């Protein structure tokens, strides 16, 4: 369709081989059985194969394979480059750039001096850092300059959410605040909690908040009013999930509760953890809970039955990510585990000779890599598929004498790291690492 152009315009020398002599459509069919590594090699045999191995609908299919789903445009005997091939190649380069590309020194965004970064958001090109310094800061992931400082809270910030230009914050001052991320202006102060606002989860137009007062509150992000109050927990509420339909909450009362928010009704009390529930994941079908009991329970939301209780960690499960029934759990036992929550299999433990030396503070993952951060001052890249250590993405000099990495967000091309120390050996700051190509 678009390869006939190149044929009758870059007239290639006659070829005496098998695929140059097939009807174009049949050569394309044959070349469609190859993997990109081999299509990429074939393109280098001769001018005829190069033109044929750049068919758009050949690569639209390979990109759909690796979940690309979006072409790349870049506005001498010339060439009509495929956007789906540029899209595929670009991704493989970003991948190899994370895995083994030289680490260009990061942008350092200094702020929240001598305090803790307690929450991190990363949204397009904006970063939001929250702190016990009472403030939040909005940054540009591109320039590294501080754009705004969200001042108004009388106590320390301890949770946050970000949709798009709306920032939600939680503080020890018992209040949540709705913010405009461009203007820096606070547009609502949400009153109702009687204790510190510990967690929050935003789904579209509503944020659910958990407090040290043992309650949850559902709020309208636009009208700034408080729609519901979920009462039933007996100790502080530490984690919360909200999919638009149920609220799932975990607390220091050893319990996980499932709610219907509209009716304010507790549908299920999930019982089994023998210590505080500290982290939660919910995909509308399964709720996944991690506790100081060293266990991670997988529950069925619609019945409240416990499907799996996943054992093996030895300490608090600090963070978890759930995606397509793959669970990644980080722990204070200095260990990251990849679980298959369909079968309960523990697919991998990340514990090399290059294992973390302190607790895991944060993690992120995608189809290729797990990214982990720790008290040891490091952020490590791991191969999801093999469980193997790849490399240290960050290695604070102060890691062993006080320097810690509190939190990471990753995009497809950048890594953001919240870094600091309780003892002054690390000035507190964000690090931005760029893994893009051209």
């Amino acid at each position: 369709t678009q390869v006939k152009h190149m044929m009758q315009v870059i007239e290639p020398q006659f070829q005496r081989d098998f695929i140059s002599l097939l009807p174009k459509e049949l050569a394309l069919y044959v070349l469609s059985f190859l993997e990109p590594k081999d299509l990429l090699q074939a393109a280098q045999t001769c001018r005829y194969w190069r033109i044929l191995a750049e068919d758009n609908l050949l690569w639209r299919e390979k990109c759909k394979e690796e979940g690309i789903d979006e072409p790349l445009h870049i506005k001498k005997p010339g060439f009509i480059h495929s956007p789906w091939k540029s899209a595929y190649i670009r991704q493989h380069r970003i991948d190899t750039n994370w895995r083994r590309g030289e680490l260009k020194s990061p942008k350092v965004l200094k702020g929240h001096d001598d305090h803790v970064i307690t929450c991190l958001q990363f949204c397009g090109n904006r970063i939001v850092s929250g702190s016990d310094d009472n403030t939040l800061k909005v940054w540009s992931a591109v320039t590294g300059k501080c754009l705004r400082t969200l001042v108004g809270h009388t106590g320390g910030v301890w949770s946050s959410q970000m949709r798009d230009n709306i920032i939600i914050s939680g503080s020890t001052d018992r209040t949540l605040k709705v913010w405009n991320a461009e203007t820096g202006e606070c547009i609502h102060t949400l009153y109702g909690h009687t204790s510190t606002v510990r967690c929050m989860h935003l789904h579209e137009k509503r944020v659910v908040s958990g407090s040290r007062d043992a309650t949850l509150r559902v709020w309208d992000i636009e009208t700034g009013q408080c729609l519901h109050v979920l009462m039933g927990h007996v100790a502080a509420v530490r984690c919360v999930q909200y999919d638009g339909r149920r609220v799932v909450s975990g607390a220091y009362d050893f319990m996980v509760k499932v709610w219907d928010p509209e009716t304010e009704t507790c549908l299920h009390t999930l019982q089994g953890h023998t210590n505080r529930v500290y982290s939660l994941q919910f995909d509308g079908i399964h709720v996944v809970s991690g506790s100081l009991d060293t266990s991670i329970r997988v529950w069925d939301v619609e019945t409240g039955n416990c499907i799996h209780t996943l054992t093996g960690h030895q300490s608090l499960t600090s963070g978890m990510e759930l995606k397509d029934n793959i669970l990644v759990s980080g722990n204070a036992d200095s260990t990251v585990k990849i679980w298959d929550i369909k079968t309960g299999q523990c697919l991998q433990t990340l514990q090399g000779p290059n294992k973390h030396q302190s607790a895991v503070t944060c993690l992120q993952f995608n189809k290729n890599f797990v990214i982990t951060s720790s008290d040891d001052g490091t952020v490590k890249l791991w191969d999801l598929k093999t469980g193997e250590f790849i490399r240290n993405l960050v290695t604070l000099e102060s890691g062993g004498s006080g320097g810690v990495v509190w939190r990471i967000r990753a995009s497809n091309t950048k890594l953001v790291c919240a870094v600091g120390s309780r003892n002054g050996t690390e000035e507190t700051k964000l690090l931005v690492l760029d893994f893009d190509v051209d």
């Binding site: 320390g156 510190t196 030895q314 608090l316 600090s318 036992d333 302190s358 607790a359 509190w406």
Partner: peptide, 12 residues
């Protein structure tokens, strides 16, 4: 059991 190395707001 290396927890409480993770931050958490002070008590009131």
């Amino acid at each position: 059991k290396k927890f409480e190395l993770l931050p958490t707001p002070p008590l009131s």
